[PDB]
Amino acid sequence: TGRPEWIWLALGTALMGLGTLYFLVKGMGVSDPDAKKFYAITTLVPAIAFTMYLSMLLGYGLTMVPFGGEQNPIYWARYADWLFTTPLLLLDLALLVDADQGTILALVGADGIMIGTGLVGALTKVYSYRFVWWAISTAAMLYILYVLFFGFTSKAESMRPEVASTFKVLRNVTVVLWSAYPVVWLIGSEGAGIVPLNIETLLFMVLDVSAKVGFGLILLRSRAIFGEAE
Numbered sequence: 001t002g003r004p005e006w007i008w009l010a011l012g013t014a015l016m017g018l019g020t021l022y023f024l025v026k027g028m029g030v031s032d033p034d035a036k037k038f039y040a041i042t043t044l045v046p047a048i049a050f051t052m053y054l055s056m057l058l059g060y061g062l063t064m065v066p067f068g069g070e071q072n073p074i075y076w077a078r079y080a081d082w083l084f085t086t087p088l089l090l091l092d093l094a095l096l097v098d099a100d101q102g103t104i105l106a107l108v109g110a111d112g113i114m115i116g117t118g119l120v121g122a123l124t125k126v127y128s129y130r131f132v133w134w135a136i137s138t139a140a141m142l143y144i145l146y147v148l149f150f151g152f153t154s155k156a157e158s159m160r161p162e163v164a165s166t167f168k169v170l171r172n173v174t175v176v177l178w179s180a181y182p183v184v185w186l187i188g189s190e191g192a193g194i195v196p197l198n199i200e201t202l203l204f205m206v207l208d209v210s211a212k213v214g215f216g217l218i219l220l221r222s223r224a225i226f227g228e229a230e
């Protein structure tokens with residue numbers, strides 16, 4: 001409670017934990033193999049985020065990085081979370097549209113580059129270089145968003161209508177929410193430092209819960225997750 005952002009870390013921990021438990025109960029008894037994949041991916045996402053939020057709440061996922069002549073508090077646990085949860089969210093989208101394996105690898109690999117370069121930027125001690133890493137990570141994000149809109153055209157013709165509808169909604173949610181992350185980083189404690197860490201932490205909490213639990217609720221309530229069966 002010594003760090004003002006503790007309240008948002010505590011709320012994030014609670015919301016990710018509750019979301020995990022809700023998806024775990026909702027997925028009980030699901031037998032359809034396709035739906036099992038979506039429940040597994042989508043429950044694993046807030047479960048991982050729960051552990052990383054808790055690690056930030058308890059102080060383990062925080063480190064001090066010297067730059068700008070200050071000791072800057074950097075929550076590195078965010079990147080350990082996103083390293084696994086962001087490819088999993090992309091996998092949800094890719095499986096919906098029955099993406100080619102090559103497209104899945106392009107997405108997951110670009111996503112690993114996005115998170116890894118974000119982590120390097122977050123830990124870099126030379127201030128100006130932090131924004132070089134931010135730019136590379138943003139380029140990887142833009143590549144991901146490009147694929148989400150322009151890499152699935154060969155699947156549109158054979159796509160079930162409920163699949164197309166649910167994918168379109170989830171893709172829109174993804175572009176809007178994922179785009180905000182580089183802005184928050186750029187203006188917050190990692191970047192230019194014009195928004196204080198407590199407000200940056202609130203912003204990431206709202207984004208994370210929306211991108212994980214909100215996304216998850218939209219997906220797991222849809223009939224698109226079930227194979228077409230009589």
Ligand SMILES: CCCCCCCC/C=C\CCCCCCCC(=O)OC[C@H](O)CO
Pocket residue numbers: 102103105106109110113136139140143151
């Ligand atoms: C000037 C420096 C230029 C280099 C900057 C690179 C650093 C990372 C930036 C963006 C990630 C690019 C992601 C690379 C993944 C591309 C995979 C691919 O090409 O997939 C095509 C295939 O058809 C499947 O759809």
